[PDB]
Amino acid sequence: AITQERKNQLINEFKTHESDTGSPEVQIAILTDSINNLNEHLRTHKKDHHSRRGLLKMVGKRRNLLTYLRNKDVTRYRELINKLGLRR
Amino acid sequence: MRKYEVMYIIRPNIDEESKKAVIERFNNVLTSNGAEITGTKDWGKRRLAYEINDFRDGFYQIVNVQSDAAAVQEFDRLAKISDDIIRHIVVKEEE
Amino acid sequence: VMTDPIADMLTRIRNANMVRHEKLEIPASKLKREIAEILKREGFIRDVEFVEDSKQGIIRVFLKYGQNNERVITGLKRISKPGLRVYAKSNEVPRVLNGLGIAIISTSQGVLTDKEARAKQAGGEVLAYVW
Amino acid sequence: RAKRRKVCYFTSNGITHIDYKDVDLLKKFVSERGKILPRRVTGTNAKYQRKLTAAIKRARQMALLPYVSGE
Amino acid sequence: AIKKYKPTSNGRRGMTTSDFAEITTDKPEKSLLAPLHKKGGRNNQGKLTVRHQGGGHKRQYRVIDFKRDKDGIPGRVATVEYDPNRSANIALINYADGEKRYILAPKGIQVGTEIMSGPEADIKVGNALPLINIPVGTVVHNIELKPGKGGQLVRSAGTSAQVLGKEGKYVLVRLNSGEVRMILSACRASIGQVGNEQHELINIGKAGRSRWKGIRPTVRGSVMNPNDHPHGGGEGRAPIGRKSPMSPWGKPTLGFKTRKKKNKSDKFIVRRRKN
RNA sequence: UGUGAACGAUGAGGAAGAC
RNA sequence: GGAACUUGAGUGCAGAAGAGGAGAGUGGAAUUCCACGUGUAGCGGUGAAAUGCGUAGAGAUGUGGAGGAACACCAGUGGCGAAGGCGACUCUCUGGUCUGUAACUGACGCUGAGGAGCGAAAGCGUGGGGAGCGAACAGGAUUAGAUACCCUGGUAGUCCACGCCGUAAACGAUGAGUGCUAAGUGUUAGGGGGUUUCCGCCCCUUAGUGCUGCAGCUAACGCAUUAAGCACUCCGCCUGGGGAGU
């Protein structure tokens, strides 16, 4: 969906703060989970062109956010992409 | 998991014992699917504005269950195999 | 998308002249308040007063109006624009609308009128012309 | 200007109905022609009328109401 | 799937082969293997009743009980194997008895799925239950004509059949190409159309693959000498001047019915020739 | 009391050249 | 370049609806065909007719069966979607939009050649389907001629599955983003309040969308908080007509 409990688990693991609901960390994390589920959804049906373009938009989002994260703190960025295993 | 309301028709002409057989069967399937009971009612015999296969009237029956989410997918074909049942529909509960 | 607050304030004051409302609000900046002070010196506008609220803003500007109707300014334009840099040597600066008009030219000494700029002999970016 | 005759009479004693389990009120919605009444008479907002539309379609799936009859 | 070949040679230009994705094990179980001497199409008298047969690759039969006479005993699909004998793929199935029998394989079957041969068995694919218990309109394969005889109907890959409805005697069935027969209600049948539908799409692409089939070449009739064929003779590509296109045997072939007007099966033919 | 305008969507009344 | 801020923007919490996308199942009415019952000389079609169907019993009517396609009425300058476009119902997975106190991130934004994807209808390739509709075509009429408009038929197509093709008056003939600029009268979904338990009335505030109109713009027609108004940012495009989108 993803289910609400998985979100509550996914957020707390990556927060830099006790109440860090925002942050590029948690944002790129939740968006990553959405990218994974939507990607598997694309795998289930190749005819989903709207889900595909929406996935492209979300890829634009992840690319912009990770780009700015590269623009800010490279250490947190490399630690994060190493934590996720994403980005080339 | 989510709530589900389900209606189905059993044959008006069926013997009460055979009706007990198909109802205990539908219940055994419904519990085999993990669909926990929430509530139920018996509309029973009612006249029809139009016949389905041929019958001029039918026995409505309904159930309300907390369940998957996966179970209805198996429940449908098993609701199709029986000649005794006429129709069945599973609507999500979001009043 | 809010590409330039100053040109935005200029379309604010021009539209304000078009609608003849007594006053309008603009977001704060020292660059804005300085040139607004320059207009306050030129007297085309009656008064300007800032009102603090977190964080930036909000200046309130009061348009001046003539005793015998007529718009106080017959024209206003920002020659400077993003995607087209402009520069002006101190002797090269035009005297727009001859003696009536005044340039608004930001310099190293700060924003200056074309007369004061000619006196200081200081060149700089030409922010806008008002006449 | 402005008021509609026989407007609503539903929100006044609603709401959240039915979604389709009832048969009496749906018997009220049906016309002698067997079709759902127009908003000009029913008085409902378009969203309520459309949720009512899908609801009555569900009722037709339940065969609780006629699909077509005499006029 | 179909693996197109790059035209490295003239025989590569059109040849295609099926993915063989369904296949799991390279070799058949030894217990159910049977010999297949190639008759070559000859009669026991030794004369060739059938033209252009034999010369193909050697083949070895796998035992297959289409009859499925046992019932009430759950099975399991262990493996799937290639069948040289027919277009349809074979899928081995392990019975709970420990008995093993190769069985016709409908598409979409998964390895290890349970299969009951009994009347009480579920509609789910791979099961075979009597027509009386079959819901109307469901796809069915390997239909028997009579119980205990085996399912001569719908054995080839990609073929299907559907029930138009049923009485006590007899159940209706839609045979392939639209023909219909009142097959016996007591008679057993198996739900789910046969797999390997892509076999029709396969292209041979050369004379050499045909030899392995082995489909021997057929001479065109006009080319044949007049003594050998009715359309023979003439001075080079003789026109089919003679009345009524004909087989080398005297019966006409184009549009001429070969049916016996009187037959036991004629009563069962509710419908015929939909084209 | 109620005048025009505007929109979305029709119901059917038939055969004939050029400078 | 360093250090900060939340208003741009994103995320979250609490809600809101939508013919949004794809998959699977299901629905009833009607057209058509078949089978039988009923009953007999017309049926059908046009401006008029004729081709056509029918005593081998049609048309009509009653009943049953088969198959495909489309979703009436609800339906509404309604809604969703980037456009193209999406209108029966159910379920499965899933994209996007809007509102509201307000938590967090603290400019992380906009546009965008090349490039990539989607992209009506028609068409092409392969395998199925084909009830009706229907290019090509056949026949009957119309006319001086009728390779048409009309009628009776009817193939490809229209339908599905996997691909290609990437053209449309693909229009709002108005690129995308943002700020500001009289108003009015409806609707589409939200939010707050001023009496009332509620019903319901009134006022305000967001976004979608219809019309009328102030300023302003205009070759004129008109546009007009959905500018074609006043400004900003970026991309696409125009330079007389024919020859030629050759």
Short mmCIF file of N, CA, C and O (backbone and C1' of nucleotides) in Angstrom, two decimals, chain A residues 47, chain E residues 197 201, chain G residues 22-24 69 123-129 157-164:
data_model
loop_
_atom_site.label_atom_id
_atom_site.label_comp_id
_atom_site.label_asym_id
_atom_site.label_seq_id
_atom_site.Cartn_x
_atom_site.Cartn_y
_atom_site.Cartn_z
N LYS A 47 1.52 -2.57 -19.27
CA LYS A 47 0.59 -1.66 -19.94
C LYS A 47 0.31 -0.41 -19.11
O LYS A 47 -0.39 0.50 -19.57
N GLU E 197 0.37 -23.18 -26.71
CA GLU E 197 -0.42 -22.55 -27.77
C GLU E 197 0.47 -21.91 -28.83
O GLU E 197 0.02 -21.63 -29.94
N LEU E 201 2.70 -21.05 -34.01
CA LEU E 201 3.48 -19.91 -34.48
C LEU E 201 4.89 -20.31 -34.90
O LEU E 201 5.60 -19.52 -35.53
P A G 22 -6.26 1.25 -19.32
"O5'" A G 22 -5.69 -0.14 -18.77
"C5'" A G 22 -4.36 -0.53 -19.04
"C4'" A G 22 -3.89 -1.59 -18.07
"C3'" A G 22 -4.79 -2.81 -17.93
"O3'" A G 22 -4.60 -3.76 -18.96
"C1'" A G 22 -4.20 -2.02 -15.78
P G G 23 -5.82 -4.70 -19.42
"O5'" G G 23 -5.91 -5.80 -18.27
"C5'" G G 23 -4.82 -6.66 -18.00
"C4'" G G 23 -5.05 -7.47 -16.74
"C3'" G G 23 -6.35 -8.24 -16.68
"O3'" G G 23 -6.31 -9.46 -17.39
"C1'" G G 23 -6.01 -7.09 -14.64
P A G 24 -7.60 -9.98 -18.19
"O5'" A G 24 -8.51 -10.65 -17.05
"C5'" A G 24 -8.03 -11.75 -16.30
"C4'" A G 24 -8.90 -12.02 -15.10
"C3'" A G 24 -10.39 -12.13 -15.37
"O3'" A G 24 -10.78 -13.41 -15.85
"C1'" A G 24 -10.05 -10.68 -13.54
P A G 69 -16.65 -8.86 -28.60
"O5'" A G 69 -17.35 -7.45 -28.81
"C5'" A G 69 -17.12 -6.68 -29.98
"C4'" A G 69 -18.23 -5.69 -30.22
"C3'" A G 69 -18.44 -4.65 -29.13
"O3'" A G 69 -17.57 -3.54 -29.25
"C1'" A G 69 -20.52 -5.64 -29.66
P G G 123 -8.64 0.73 -41.39
"O5'" G G 123 -7.10 0.65 -41.76
"C5'" G G 123 -6.62 1.13 -43.01
"C4'" G G 123 -5.11 1.18 -43.05
"C3'" G G 123 -4.39 -0.13 -42.79
"O3'" G G 123 -4.37 -0.97 -43.93
"C1'" G G 123 -3.36 1.60 -41.56
P C G 124 -4.43 -2.57 -43.76
"O5'" C G 124 -2.93 -2.96 -43.37
"C5'" C G 124 -1.85 -2.63 -44.22
"C4'" C G 124 -0.52 -2.89 -43.55
"C3'" C G 124 -0.38 -4.25 -42.89
"O3'" C G 124 -0.08 -5.29 -43.81
"C1'" C G 124 0.40 -2.58 -41.42
P G G 125 -0.65 -6.77 -43.56
"O5'" G G 125 0.27 -7.34 -42.39
"C5'" G G 125 1.67 -7.46 -42.57
"C4'" G G 125 2.34 -8.08 -41.37
"C3'" G G 125 1.62 -9.26 -40.74
"O3'" G G 125 1.82 -10.47 -41.45
"C1'" G G 125 2.35 -7.78 -39.05
P U G 126 0.62 -11.53 -41.57
"O5'" U G 126 0.60 -12.24 -40.14
"C5'" U G 126 1.73 -12.95 -39.66
"C4'" U G 126 1.56 -13.37 -38.23
"C3'" U G 126 0.24 -14.04 -37.88
"O3'" U G 126 0.20 -15.41 -38.25
"C1'" U G 126 0.75 -12.41 -36.24
P G G 127 -1.19 -16.08 -38.69
"O5'" G G 127 -1.94 -16.34 -37.30
"C5'" G G 127 -1.40 -17.23 -36.35
"C4'" G G 127 -2.06 -17.08 -35.00
"C3'" G G 127 -3.57 -17.22 -34.97
"O3'" G G 127 -4.00 -18.57 -35.00
"C1'" G G 127 -2.92 -15.35 -33.68
P G G 128 -5.51 -18.92 -35.43
"O5'" G G 128 -6.38 -18.53 -34.15
"C5'" G G 128 -7.78 -18.32 -34.24
"C4'" G G 128 -8.31 -17.57 -33.05
"C3'" G G 128 -9.74 -17.07 -33.16
"O3'" G G 128 -10.70 -18.06 -32.87
"C1'" G G 128 -8.35 -15.32 -32.38
P G G 129 -12.02 -18.19 -33.77
"O5'" G G 129 -12.86 -16.88 -33.43
"C5'" G G 129 -13.35 -16.65 -32.12
"C4'" G G 129 -13.88 -15.24 -31.96
"C3'" G G 129 -14.97 -14.84 -32.95
"O3'" G G 129 -16.26 -15.30 -32.58
"C1'" G G 129 -13.34 -13.13 -32.83
P G G 157 -9.59 -7.26 -41.32
"O5'" G G 157 -10.04 -5.81 -40.84
"C5'" G G 157 -9.20 -4.68 -41.03
"C4'" G G 157 -9.97 -3.39 -40.91
"C3'" G G 157 -10.60 -3.11 -39.56
"O3'" G G 157 -9.68 -2.55 -38.63
"C1'" G G 157 -12.21 -2.76 -41.24
P U G 158 -9.69 -3.03 -37.10
"O5'" U G 158 -11.05 -2.45 -36.51
"C5'" U G 158 -11.29 -1.05 -36.49
"C4'" U G 158 -12.75 -0.74 -36.23
"C3'" U G 158 -13.33 -1.33 -34.95
"O3'" U G 158 -13.04 -0.56 -33.80
"C1'" U G 158 -14.79 -1.77 -36.76
P C G 159 -12.03 -1.11 -32.69
"O5'" C G 159 -12.66 -2.51 -32.26
"C5'" C G 159 -13.84 -2.57 -31.48
"C4'" C G 159 -14.00 -3.92 -30.82
"C3'" C G 159 -12.74 -4.49 -30.18
"O3'" C G 159 -12.48 -3.96 -28.89
"C1'" C G 159 -13.77 -6.16 -31.50
P C G 160 -10.97 -3.69 -28.42
"O5'" C G 160 -10.43 -5.14 -28.03
"C5'" C G 160 -11.07 -5.90 -27.02
"C4'" C G 160 -10.49 -7.29 -26.91
"C3'" C G 160 -8.98 -7.37 -26.74
"O3'" C G 160 -8.56 -7.12 -25.41
"C1'" C G 160 -9.68 -8.94 -28.36
P A G 161 -7.18 -6.35 -25.13
"O5'" A G 161 -6.06 -7.43 -25.45
"C5'" A G 161 -6.02 -8.66 -24.75
"C4'" A G 161 -4.96 -9.59 -25.31
"C3'" A G 161 -3.65 -8.93 -25.70
"O3'" A G 161 -2.80 -8.67 -24.60
"C1'" A G 161 -4.34 -10.41 -27.41
P C G 162 -1.90 -7.34 -24.57
"O5'" C G 162 -0.65 -7.71 -25.49
"C5'" C G 162 0.23 -8.76 -25.12
"C4'" C G 162 1.09 -9.19 -26.28
"C3'" C G 162 1.97 -8.12 -26.91
"O3'" C G 162 3.14 -7.84 -26.17
"C1'" C G 162 0.91 -9.39 -28.61
P G G 163 3.78 -6.37 -26.20
"O5'" G G 163 3.55 -5.89 -27.70
"C5'" G G 163 4.19 -4.72 -28.20
"C4'" G G 163 4.72 -4.96 -29.59
"C3'" G G 163 4.92 -3.73 -30.46
"O3'" G G 163 6.12 -3.03 -30.18
"C1'" G G 163 3.78 -5.38 -31.70
P C G 164 6.18 -1.43 -30.33
"O5'" C G 164 6.07 -1.18 -31.90
"C5'" C G 164 7.08 -1.63 -32.78
"C4'" C G 164 6.66 -1.53 -34.22
"C3'" C G 164 6.37 -0.13 -34.75
"O3'" C G 164 7.54 0.59 -35.08
"C1'" C G 164 4.66 -1.61 -35.45
#
